[PDB]
Symmetry: D2
Subunit: 445 residues, 4 copies
């Protein structure tokens, strides 16, 4: 379109504003009628549910910004949505729309997925401040209600807090995304679109979990055991732990995943097999205890002490272990349950050793700015390992679904090719393209 062309041409703020908004846009999406298609299905192949096609351009709310999405990423929630698990997102869209007003737009027979992105502002609602068409932005997933009192204590805490592209429509896996202005941050200038896009959700989430005073709040010298360490969350977890003067201990399930975490500077790596952790471990209290003890011993061996923080998200199969291995007074911080949300743990290890389990979710706008600042300095780098064109986003999603990736799989959206969007090439040169892409071309194959 004239708008996409203007965006892609690096046209001026005024020219971008002057290019009309298309009536439809290309979006990776789910269809409400398919929400039952995986009933009984063992391998709920996201490529079967994901559609790519034109969806209606919605009306922009006054506090919203239309972003020409240059790139986005696959997040696990993209996978979960495409799997209609644990609940089809359409149920969330309907709950969202039940607020009425502007919220109603979310309830659509399609759901445009994508929960972070980088791109270019093309329109702002009349209540949007500062942002101008042409502005290079990243969008983080915290779609929150700033009228809620809770939001002003913690952006993540409001009852209306939602994840963009998951509990909201108009996500980032599309040529355009509709975001609340409080989802917007300036794109790190030295990064490409795809590099910038891969971070907000996972890095912000890891940031809240580990760095922010809203999570485990690591300090230098903390040993952080990081489960599923080579993945999206883990790839950032590692960096925050290292950057904060912590000692990460990566738990990975393969040599390739080990390679990935080492590329991120995590030299202390535990392979799940050297502990014979298998999925049925969670049903076996004694084995959990025995393996937790062994795991603790290993962490002690590698890092010098039991972990201060255990970075959880792998869920039920590891959670028992996590509770056990954390040092007395330690914190298990969890933001997920990939292996199952029904967690079982021995409470004696929690109360008797005064441990904490901190439930964490996404990151508020402040945490996301903090995260962004760490990218802006090059302290933290994108965990991008692969890039797919939007045309192949279902496959990108599948890759994540099948755990064939390390780090983050980026999806070019409107960006016609890789390597665009660097507006501070000197800084990029100073940090180094390689330093910025530790995971380039690595897989979990």
């Amino acid at each position: 379109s004239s708008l996409s062309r203007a965006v892609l041409d690096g046209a001026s703020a005024a020219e971008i504003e002057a290019a009309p908004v298309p009536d439809t846009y290309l979006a990776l999406h789910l269809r409400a009628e398919d929400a039952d298609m995986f009933k009984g299905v063992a391998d709920k192949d996201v490529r079967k549910s994901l559609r790519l096609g034109e969806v209606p351009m919605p009306e922009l709310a006054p506090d919203e910004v239309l972003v020409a999405v240059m790139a986005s990423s696959i997040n696990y929630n993209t996978v979960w949505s495409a799997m209609f698990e644990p609940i089809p997102t359409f149920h969330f869209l309907k709950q969202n729309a039940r607020q009425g007003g502007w919220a109603t737009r979310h309830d659509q027979p399609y759901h445009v997925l994508g929960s972070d992105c980088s791109g270019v502002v093309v329109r702002t609602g009349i209540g949007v401040r500062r942002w101008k068409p042409g502005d290079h932005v990243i969008v983080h997933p915290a779609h929150v209600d700033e009228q809620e009192p809770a939001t002003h204590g913690d952006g993540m805490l409001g009852t209306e807090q939602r994840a963009w592209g998951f509990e909201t429509n108009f996500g980032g896996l599309a040529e355009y995304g509709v975001v609340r202005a409080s989802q917007l941050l300036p794109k790190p200038a030295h990064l490409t679109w795809e590099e910038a896009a891969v971070s907000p959700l996972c890095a912000g989430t890891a940031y809240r979990m580990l760095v922010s005073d809203r999570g485990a709040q690591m300090k230098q010298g903390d040993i952080v055991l990081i489960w599923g360490a080579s993945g999206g969350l883990g790839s950032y977890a590692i960096q925050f732990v290292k950057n904060g003067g912590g000692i990460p201990v990566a738990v990975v399930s393969s040599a390739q995943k080990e390679a990935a975490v080492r590329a991120l500077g995590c030299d202390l790596v535990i392979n799940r097999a050297e502990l014979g952790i298998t999925d049925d471990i969670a049903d076996d209290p004694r084995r959990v205890v025995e393996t937790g003890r062994k795991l603790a011993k290993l962490v002690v061996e590698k890092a010098g002490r039991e972990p201060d923080i255990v970075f959880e998200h792998t869920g039920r199969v590891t959670f028992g272990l996590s509770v056990i291995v954390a040092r007395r007074g330690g914190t298990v911080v969890t933001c997920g349950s990939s292996s199952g949300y029904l967690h079982t743990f021995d409470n004696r290890y929690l109360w008797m050793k005064l441990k904490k389990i901190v439930g964490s979710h996404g990151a508020n706008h402040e945490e996301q700015q903090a995260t962004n600042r760490l990218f802006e300095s090059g302290a933290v780098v994108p965990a991008m390992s692969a890039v797919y064109p939007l045309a192949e986003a279902a496959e990108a999603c599948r890759v994540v679904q099948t755990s064939r990736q390390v780090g983050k799989v980026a999806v070019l959206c409107m960006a016609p090719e890789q390597g665009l969007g660097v507006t501070d090439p000197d800084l990029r040169a100073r940090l180094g393209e390689d330093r910025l892409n530790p995971l380039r071309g690595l897989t979990a194959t």
Copy 2:
């Protein structure tokens, strides 16, 4: 006007929306032309600056709500405003307006003061959720930018955080107020307009300082020394301390003010003449130490220990004392400097005894809701001691200026008479009108 009649008649939502917004409204305001009128003037009589007259109705921003203000209150900032101290509010209005967009409205040759209020929603911007015309609200003063990341960590912390009616125009000492939706809370139903109006600013502020995890965060058993205890802040500080299971020790300068704090159930009272505190004490390090020591001894006598938290706002005169008197590891929490902001203190007492000074300001929307909840249950009650019509708001202001009040001086705005706006009379009856007005009829003389 038809709109004010509709509001006063308790009209339906539709009737209120159908009633046109007046082009102008009655407002207590200052005039930009008067900013220097107190140059080299000792007693800057607020009544010489305060104007009451029609001001233009501004256009409502999309995130704003037009409130038909039923009652408001004099706050000290109203006094500071009318004195053009320490800096004329017009400078703030201009700084505010420099943001552009909707902010430019704030820059006017008039400044409508008033930093809290209760009233009725009459219009909402297209970006406002949930509120509707007819809704009974209180407005608290935290006029914040919800797009700023900092806001999502703490609503008070954004660089665009302003105090309604002080760094913003369209304050509550008028028949209408323009507020951001995130300034709105449901008015405690059992309260009259004037009762509801007196609390948000002072109570929220005291709440942040003492109750909130963002201030000194009292716990039951804490002894809290409360300076200027019979005033707006102290009158709530006392209640939060008591309600928190803390032990308030009121410092007052007079028997009338002691009576005021006793009526709030603060039975540990220190008259500052009993200490021989005079305004020049601050210039005299030795006398501050001696007196601080006497003060500490007195708190020990009355409350059993040195205060855990010193509730400051009286400023330079008391601050050195506040630092000395606080227990080891204690917190001086301060939100003001009525006696002068150039604080001097002996840092030995601060670092050697590992004390903290917590600067606090207003309250974020979360804290304000928490505050409101305590009013809602009747745990905390309005500190209203006097009510003036808007016609006499200048005098009301002068009263506070001349420290002739205890608690809070309410100002009826649109409310034509006292006692209106109780929409939960049963609750009111249960709590008791007298419990709700401990300070009724009390003065500082």
Copy 3:
């Protein structure tokens, strides 16, 4: 003995020092040779394992205080001790003793139980400061190693932190207790021995869980769901919640337990049976969710919102519910698992709603002082519901074992009768005997 006679007669410090320490003392204790007596026994009747008789007086460590124990209390760990479950306490005693030095004394074939007490200092180790014979004290259970760096961040957090009389010997269900001076606090002067003795462990634990910045750290206005609310822990929880301007909502399993919590001024009460809780709800995730929702709904109806803090200790059966019922950003604070330590919960409710589970154990010396200060002002009162003489402490223990109690079962030790040890009768009279004993005579 002349020492016990000196203590009971309120003799001077000099006189107490001149009265020799007896070589043995009367103690409720277990014998290591009984550790196996309940193998294959379903009802591990504590009256069968608990012995009362003379045990050797140990040599006082330099940082220790010999307390003539006027009164103690039954604690849940006392029961578990007497059941030798899940591990005979002797395992903990030997583990303690493996530290060597003074710790070796704890490794004995007898274990004097008792994890709190009130009494009179009779001897101090040469490294004890300030405490003197004749001093009226309470003992709290935090037997900690003050050389450990962790102890100086949080007394509860050292690896050598132990529960007095559970992982240490010379507990307070005896006429004498051997404590570290960092277990000692001045006895609230207006309380009788038994009243003062019932509180340290449970009140301190509840304090840490709810009031302290080491626990959930309630604020006024917080709604606190209190599981097992009529018990030792619950009876103090209710009171700290109330005292701190919180809104307690007690969960109790019966009418009698409801009566107990209301006696403590907890007017919001949910009955567990009301809601169908059995030991297999935990195993039914859909039931936990549906029952949690109902519980949440019931709290919203009662308190106006979902609980800000859930005070857990009941364990597996309620824990899944706890995680569900807590508000967004809410805290489940847990110090035990009465119904089973294998907790199952739906982590979606934890992470998606940014809730926290805070594990808490005991209370450090600071928290215990803060707890004690709340007893000293009368802001919080003892939860004493019953008093047994030491002779009948096995019965008292069986009562707790069989959940026949509410609040705290006190045990007179050296105190020859109830009602002694009040040294501030004026404050006692001011507060009110009944005020101080809201649970007097109540049972489950």
Copy 4:
């Protein structure tokens, strides 16, 4: 003596035990009679007050450890005490002794100074655990009362918290030191005595101020403005800031002090002199504001934003600036007032911007362990810039008195030369001697 010989020879624990404790030992000390010796003297030259000679070996308390002090360091309190400023330390010794019991020993007509050290345990009181003669230790200054409840919440917060060798006698600027066992941590093995010795007081203090949850509690990304940055405190502050992934901005008064901070990898430096700071700036409110603004801008230029934490200790001259420059919601953490304790600041800057001033002092045993762990891993290195023998400790003290130093001036005590005490040479070599001594030979 046979003891010192046994220690320098690395004798077995049993050998160290068999060697008698001398009745006296070599100590850098003050004499009570001299307390008045600088009445009307403007330059209170510490070389005139500091004595080096034999002092009586005190009797060890049960919780105490006698350390063969190998190396110590000059601290500013050493200087202050040698000046008898602001109060002669003897006053604190008498206050300390007023506790009675073991505290009485501290009231002597001599005061042995030295507030940190590295050395070899040679005797332990009967209540001391774990430590054994021969053990290589560092001593940190937190001489605290572990019976005080406060200590169990924070070792620094007890009423009886004292600075070893300042408010206690038997400090470390001597061949032996008497320390409570809760002052002891294992000496980082890869360090020499003097390297190990220079850190505990300054690094632990900086740690508490910056890293600990008891201070400003920096996180990565934080910009930390560090006043007096080349000094003892600053030298560690810079390192904790960098190590925590923070961004330090040093303020130094000179090109040399700048060289020092850059040696510690502080890239961003603001010269104080350029800003115009004089001891009457604080007295000029307008100047403080304009100067604070230029400072803020300087920080913004260098680091990208106003500082998140202002690391204070320079006191009254800088403090008003500190309050001004700190970001909105930022923290000024202060542990001293070198330029004067009468601080003046514009409170509008504090409350209106919701800033905090956190008073900090020393570091509890936990923070000191944590600090020690960062030395153990090599994450933080000693700030030793100079070494004096104990013979020359007065001069070392004078060097610090006259701000001629950068980092930490170490004093060898029983160590007969530099370079001794490395018991993990492999780690030493991996880290690097130069790495471990960034300030070697530097001055101000």
